[PDB]
Design a protein around this ligand. Sequence first.
Ligand SMILES: [Mn+2]
Ligand SMILES: [Mn+2]
Ligand SMILES: [Mn+2]
Ligand SMILES: [Mn+2]
Ligand SMILES: [Mn+2]
Ligand SMILES: [Mn+2]
Ligand code: NA
Length: 326
Amino acid sequence: MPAYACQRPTPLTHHNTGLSEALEILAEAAGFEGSEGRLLTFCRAASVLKALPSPVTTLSQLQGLPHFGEHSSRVVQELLEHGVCEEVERVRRSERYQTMKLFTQIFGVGVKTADRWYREGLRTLDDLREQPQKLTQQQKAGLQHHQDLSTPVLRSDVDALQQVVEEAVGQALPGATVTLTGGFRRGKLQGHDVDFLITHPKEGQEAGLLPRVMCRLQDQGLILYHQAFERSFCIFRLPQPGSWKAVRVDLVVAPVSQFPFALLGWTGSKLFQRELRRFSRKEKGLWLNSHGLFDPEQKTFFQAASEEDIFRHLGLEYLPPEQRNA
DNA sequence: CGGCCTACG
DNA sequence: CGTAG
DNA sequence: GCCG
Ligand SMILES: [Mn+2]
Ligand SMILES: [Mn+2]
Ligand SMILES: [Mn+2]
Ligand SMILES: [Mn+2]
Ligand SMILES: [Mn+2]
Ligand SMILES: [Mn+2]
Ligand code: NA
């Protein structure tokens, strides 16, 4: 088992679901306390289990696995022997965990804001609604739409949404294309939002595109909320039988020269991409982001025509999106 | 021990 | 500060 | 919390 998640296939469904979910609770809780290092170790340990070919049945099967030390091994041991880990359950029921989870779920609220509200004594959404002058416009939108935004987006919803985005994109710039990214591109059947990547085959034609797209979607009455720019974090009105629901949609524009890097970055998973950027820098001495791959010694950017090119540049076996579910 | 991804709005 | 994978 |  290699130490970096980008070095091994990780399928969407696997054989250690219960174990990985428990470690991800501890990862999430570490994030709420500002310990990004502990969050990373628990996320990485969970991801190792997702990549295994069969269920872990005995503690002995953890020896030699990367990111399993005393703490993560004790969690698994308690789950194997008792079906529950007391630490995990204590986190689950804790007021701190439940409230930080509730608050950070709000669009416009991060860990730092949620923690401040927690220290001020706030605990519920209605607490926040009874003091609305303290909220940003973004947070007000996130709170008004919170119920709809807590409802999973179905892959069945995504097709209809892509065609309306394509219509606006085609008026904004004929020939421009829309690609579904994020978790749906990795094969998820549900998600918390829809992610789209927009480009145009003629380099430079994409300049100034996203404002033109947003104006057109807004004129169609489809935009419930949005803030030159190249990323837009929106709330869209999506049809429903006899009504509609609010859905989070992210739109990103990239020049076609950067498209493989943007496709790779926006297809995720989040942990996969953090691990891939870490691997690039620490093992290969190259700097990766969603715009390109930089050699800081020769002062040059790698040209990529495909995701396959990027894996080759980095000396990694190619993984299709459905094996990037770290 | 230091490091932990790397951007844009 | 928020947001993205 | 774990790697290297
Ligand atoms: Mn170990
Ligand atoms: Mn026991
Ligand atoms: Mn998504
Ligand atoms: Mn998104
Ligand atoms: Mn850019
Ligand atoms: Mn996210
Ligand atoms: Na949030």
